[PDB]
Amino acid sequence: SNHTYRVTDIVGTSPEGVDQAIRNGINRASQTLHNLDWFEVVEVRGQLNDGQIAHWQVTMKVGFRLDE
Amino acid sequence: SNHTYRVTDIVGTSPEGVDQAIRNGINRASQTLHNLDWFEVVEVRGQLNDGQIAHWQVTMKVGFRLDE
Amino acid sequence: SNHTYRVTDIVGTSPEGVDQAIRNGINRASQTLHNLDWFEVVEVRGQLNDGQIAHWQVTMKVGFRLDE
Amino acid sequence: SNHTYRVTDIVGTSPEGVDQAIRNGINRASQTLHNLDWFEVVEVRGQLNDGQIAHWQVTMKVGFRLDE
Amino acid sequence: SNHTYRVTDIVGTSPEGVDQAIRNGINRASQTLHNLDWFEVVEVRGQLNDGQIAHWQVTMKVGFRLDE
Amino acid sequence: SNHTYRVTDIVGTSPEGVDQAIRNGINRASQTLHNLDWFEVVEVRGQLNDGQIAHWQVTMKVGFRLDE
């Protein structure tokens, strides 16, 4: 009822696409941040090599509960 | 001719992903709002549950013709 | 004293210009929405054909008093 | 789980303050819009007269479930 | 008639809260600026001191009619 | 070369349209502000009465040279 959350930005990356970039970022975030509650996608970027998409980079706001 | 459009925000949700969240939102919107012309994705959120991405929420601007 | 307003987006269009696009949008909006109080221009676009301006499109926030 | 929400802007007003302006807006909105789920305060204004605050105006994003 | 308004930013402050910070700012503004018409809240800040909220600072757009 | 400018917001109004609202605002501003150099249109609003545009309100950033 009086829960407090903290939000930081995490950047997930994947050669495969936006969806996998998000999962990679959330998976890695979950290991150092406990109580991950939600994320909001705030930016989608790509690294190009020739005219080909080499890396997808997804910036997410990530909310997590502070312990009580 | 001189078509007039209205725009409101709709939030589509799905356990499955962004794509299905959008289709669910558009399908349900289409049943009360007629002449849907376009949508603009404005926000993508996810709820985590049991260490999984449980729910996707996509906020869309949805434009519809007033005229038929 | 404690009046409540609602705001939606309306897109007016006109071959003539910005001013007529707004009037067309307000006139058409006034026929389904009652008690129109104000509008705020949020976007002005033009559709070009053969490098000439065919259509003006003006997106407006439109506020209206809710009845009782 | 596959619920769809719609969001519009509602402006509550009160001579008394921000809090009462919000409650007035939500109360009146709840009478035409069913299944009100959340609101987000987006703007707080005042009408001034003789260097005194006569009216508070609070613009809120208001989300409501579409029936199923 | 064809009234003209000017708008500047005013920062009200109070140890007590947002509401009193606004009133303090408007009261002090009204003494040098005549014909105050409206304000729009643009920013709410707080200074923490000894692990307590010591000051609230509210930035407001303040509109006033120019004399004729 | 080392000229300093100040910028404030002025709201011009006219029953006739955007262009006349701007001229009315600039004319009235020029009487109390000296050395008016430029303006930038930042907002266009209207007061509606029935479904008819009664007043146009144009907010302008207005720059003026400080004397030396």
Add this chain to the structure above:
Amino acid sequence: SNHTYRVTDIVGTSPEGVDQAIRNGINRASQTLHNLDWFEVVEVRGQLNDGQIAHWQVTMKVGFRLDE
């Protein structure tokens, strides 16, 4: 089909007004950029000179098809 567009910013200018500033900008843009599809007005500025509005400057996003 799967048309690709490019968008750049163009600033049209005119002593006469906003409308002519836009036409001047679009006309000149159309001579190096082919397949102009749309423009979005993003900024309207005016230079004052000799107590008159001397120059209008309109910044437009201009979209053009790559394809013909």
Add this chain to the structure above:
Amino acid sequence: SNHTYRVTDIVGTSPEGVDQAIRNGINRASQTLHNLDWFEVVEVRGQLNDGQIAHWQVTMKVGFRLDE
């Protein structure tokens, strides 16, 4: 010394209102983050439960001095 600050987002919650949501968030933040200096309110949200306000959520930028 040339003091360095860090800023994160914290979400305070309260059934009671905005003011208490802020205090709850700041109090809880102060227990893991040392040397809290300031906060800026960036979002105020409310959960409705059968058309009554159940829960307030306030997102704040929170600045704190890094030790030396």
Add this chain to the structure above:
Amino acid sequence: SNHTYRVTDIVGTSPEGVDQAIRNGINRASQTLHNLDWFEVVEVRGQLNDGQIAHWQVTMKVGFRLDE
């Protein structure tokens, strides 16, 4: 060491989805623009027909190294 980049907006389109809209836009952009380095998604739209998604349109900032 002192590389210079340029950035323009590109709109990719696809009947298939966001991912393919981006690839189509990047592929076509790479044929007139050399040394594509990165892209940033700035807008995702869909054109609806009979309340079904016909076309995805993705606006991207696209950065490319200038030659010597």
Add this chain to the structure above:
Amino acid sequence: SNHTYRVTDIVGTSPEGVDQAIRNGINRASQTLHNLDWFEVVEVRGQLNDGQIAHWQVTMKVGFRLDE
């Protein structure tokens, strides 16, 4: 006392650079506006003259205490 601040925009200019443009603007502002407390840089522009940087313009929010 509960101090009240006013904020206006000032544009400082210098042939030399950003830093000197700011100091010129603040110095000149300090002569008509009393009790200058803070500034926030909001825009940095440069005029080119045959492909060399001739003039810097820095727009700043400037806060000053109102007397009591």
Add this chain to the structure above:
Amino acid sequence: SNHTYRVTDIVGTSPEGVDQAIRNGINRASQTLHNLDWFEVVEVRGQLNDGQIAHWQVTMKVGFRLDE
């Protein structure tokens, strides 16, 4: 008087600082783009390595006159 300008984004880089990053970008831009008139700094970034600033990156809006 009826001059038309075009604006694109250019990213200058330098190991030395913001000022040199801008000059590098403007110098290189001036070689392919003729009639450079102004720039507006829109973003300043750094590449960090071993907690040290290796590269400065400055994104600038750059305006240039189209030939007549």
Add this chain to the structure above:
Amino acid sequence: SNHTYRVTDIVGTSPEGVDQAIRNGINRASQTLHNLDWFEVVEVRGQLNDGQIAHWQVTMKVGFRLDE
């Protein structure tokens, strides 16, 4: 590989200027945050004291690689 980054805000301060404020912030940040990759300048402020610029405050987004 599929590197994950985190981003927080850091405020560097210096009596000397923007450049030194950034370096002070990055240096102090590097001592608690490992694997600093980039920063983005988001805000530049100055405190005025005795009619002089006493402190520069630069807010930066700071990205760092998460360990694996």
